[PDB]
C-alpha cells in the first residue's frame, strides 16, 4: 500500500510549552500551543520532548515509531502530528484533554461504569490489534500510557520502547523495562513479541478494573518472576465476573502460544460490552 501518511518537521518557534503533563517513557511530555507555519489557529498539543543524548539506533527507533505513528491509523492510537528535529528530538500529538487512563479511572472511581471498562478494554484491544497489523511491539503499555480523548474514547500513546518488526521477524531481542508489566519470556530472556504485548495488555485490564490499583503492590521487583513462576498471578479485582477475570489469566500463561490474539480480545470484550452488567457487577467497588 501506499502509505501517504503526512509527517510534518516542525520548527521549535511553532511551538509554546505551557505546563508538563507528566513523564512519558524516556521523556518529558508537556502541554502545549502549536501554531503551524502559514497558519494562524492555536492547536493544543502533547510535545514529547526525548532525551539529548541519542545513540544511531535510538534514533533509528524514534524515526520507525514516526513512520507507523504517522498514519490515519487506529482511532485507538494517538497519531504523532508532528517531529522537531533540534539538537533534542520533541514528538507532537494532539492533546487529549482528560489525561492519561491512569489517573482518569483514580480519580473517578466512583463514577465509572461496567460499559465504560469494557468499551475502554475493547477500545485498548483494538488499538493494539492495529499496531500488531502494522508490526509495532509496544512492549509498554499500561494503563499510565493509554490516554482519554473523552469518556467513550481511549488512545494508546508513548510508544518510548516500542519496536518496529522486520518483515519476518517474529521478536525483538532489547536498558530499563516495564518488569510488574511484563511477560516472564520478557523479563528472563528480553524476547518481546506481541504476544508478551498481550501479557502487558492483561495487567492494563487488571489496572482499570481495580480503579488504577499498583499491581503486584509492595512486593519488591526482583521477587516478579520468582512469583510468577510460582504461579501467582494478580488477584481477581472485585469488580469483575469470572468471564472478565478468565480473559485475564489467559494473558498471562507462561506458554506465550496460550495466550489470547488481540483479535480474540477485541471479539471478547466487544461481546461483553453489549451487556456490561452481566459481566462487571460494579456496586463490588464498595
Ligand atoms: O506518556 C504517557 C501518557 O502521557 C500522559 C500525558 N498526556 C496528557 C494528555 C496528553 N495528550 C497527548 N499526549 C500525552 N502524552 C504523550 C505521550 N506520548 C507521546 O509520544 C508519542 C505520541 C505519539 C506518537 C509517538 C511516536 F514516537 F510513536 F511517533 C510518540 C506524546 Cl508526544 C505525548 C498526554
Given at each position: 500500500?501506499?502509505?501517504?501518511?503526512?509527517?510534518?518537521?516542525?520548527?521549535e518557534?511553532?511551538?509554546?510549552?505551557?505546563?508538563?503533563?507528566?513523564?512519558?517513557?524516556?521523556?518529558?511530555?508537556?502541554?502545549?500551543?502549536?501554531?503551524?507555519?502559514?497558519?494562524?489557529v492555536?492547536?493544543?498539543?502533547?510535545?514529547?520532548?526525548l532525551?539529548?543524548?541519542?545513540?544511531?539506533?535510538?534514533?533509528?527507533?524514534?524515526?520507525?515509531?514516526?513512520?507507523?505513528?504517522?498514519?490515519?491509523?487506529?482511532?485507538?492510537?494517538?497519531?504523532?502530528?508532528?517531529?522537531?528535529?533540534?539538537?533534542?528530538?520533541?514528538?507532537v500529538?494532539?492533546?487529549?484533554?482528560?489525561?492519561?487512563?491512569?489517573?482518569?479511572?483514580?480519580?473517578?472511581?466512583?463514577?465509572?461504569?461496567?460499559?465504560?471498562?469494557?468499551?475502554?478494554?475493547?477500545?485498548?484491544?483494538?488499538?493494539?490489534?492495529?499496531?500488531?497489523?502494522?508490526?509495532?511491539?509496544?512492549?509498554?503499555?499500561?494503563?499510565?500510557?493509554?490516554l482519554?480523548?473523552?469518556?467513550?474514547?481511549?488512545?494508546?500513546?508513548?510508544?518510548?520502547?516500542?519496536r518496529?518488526?522486520?518483515?519476518?521477524?517474529?521478536?525483538?531481542?532489547?536498558?530499563?523495562?516495564?518488569?510488574?508489566?511484563?511477560?516472564?519470556?520478557?523479563?528472563?530472556?528480553?524476547?518481546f513479541?506481541?504476544?508478551?504485548?498481550?501479557?502487558?495488555?492483561?495487567?492494563?485490564?487488571?489496572?482499570?478494573?481495580?480503579?488504577?490499583?499498583?499491581?503486584?503492590?509492595?512486593?519488591?521487583?526482583?521477587?516478579?518472576?520468582?512469583?510468577?513462576?510460582?504461579?501467582?498471578?494478580?488477584?481477581?479485582?472485585?469488580?469483575?465476573?469470572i468471564?472478565?477475570?478468565?480473559?485475564?489469566?489467559?494473558?498471562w500463561?507462561?506458554?506465550?502460544?496460550?495466550?489470547?490474539?488481540?483479535?480474540?480480545?477485541?471479539?471478547?470484550?466487544?461481546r461483553?460490552?453489549?451487556?456490561?452488567?452481566?459481566?462487571?457487577?460494579?456496586?463490588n467497588?464498595?
Amino acid at each position: 500500500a501506499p502509505n501517504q501518511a503526512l509527517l510534518r518537521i516542525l520548527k521549535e518557534t511553532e511551538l509554546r510549552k505551557v505546563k508538563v503533563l507528566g513523564s512519558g517513557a524516556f521523556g518529558t511530555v508537556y502541554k502545549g500551543i502549536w501554531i503551524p507555519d502559514g497558519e494562524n489557529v492555536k492547536i493544543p498539543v502533547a510535545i514529547k520532548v526525548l532525551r539529548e543524548n541519542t545513540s544511531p539506533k535510538a534514533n533509528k527507533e524514534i524515526l520507525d515509531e514516526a513512520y507507523v505513528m504517522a498514519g490515519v491509523g487506529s482511532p485507538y492510537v494517538s497519531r504523532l502530528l508532528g517531529i522537531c528535529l533540534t539538537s533534542t528530538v520533541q514528538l507532537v500529538t494532539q492533546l487529549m484533554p482528560y489525561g492519561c487512563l491512569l489517573d482518569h479511572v483514580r480519580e473517578n472511581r466512583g463514577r465509572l461504569g461496567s460499559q465504560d471498562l469494557l468499551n475502554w478494554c475493547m477500545q485498548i484491544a483494538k488499538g493494539m490489534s492495529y499496531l500488531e497489523d502494522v508490526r509495532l511491539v509496544h512492549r509498554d503499555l499500561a494503563a499510565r500510557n493509554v490516554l482519554v480523548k473523552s469518556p467513550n474514547h481511549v488512545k494508546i500513546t508513548d510508544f518510548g520502547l516500542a519496536r518496529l518488526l522486520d518483515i519476518d521477524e517474529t521478536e525483538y531481542h532489547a536498558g530499563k523495562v516495564p518488569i510488574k508489566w511484563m511477560a516472564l519470556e520478557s523479563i528472563l530472556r528480553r524476547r518481546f513479541t506481541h504476544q508478551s504485548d498481550v501479557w502487558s495488555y492483561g495487567v492494563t485490564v487488571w489496572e482499570l478494573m481495580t480503579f488504577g490499583a499498583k499491581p503486584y503492590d509492595g512486593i519488591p521487583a526482583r521477587e516478579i518472576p520468582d512469583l510468577l513462576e510460582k504461579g501467582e498471578r494478580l488477584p481477581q479485582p472485585p469488580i469483575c465476573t469470572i468471564d472478565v477475570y478468565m480473559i485475564m489469566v489467559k494473558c498471562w500463561m507462561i506458554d506465550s502460544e496460550c495466550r489470547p490474539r488481540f483479535r480474540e480480545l477485541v471479539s471478547e470484550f466487544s461481546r461483553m460490552a453489549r451487556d456490561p452488567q452481566r459481566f462487571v457487577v460494579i456496586q463490588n467497588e464498595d
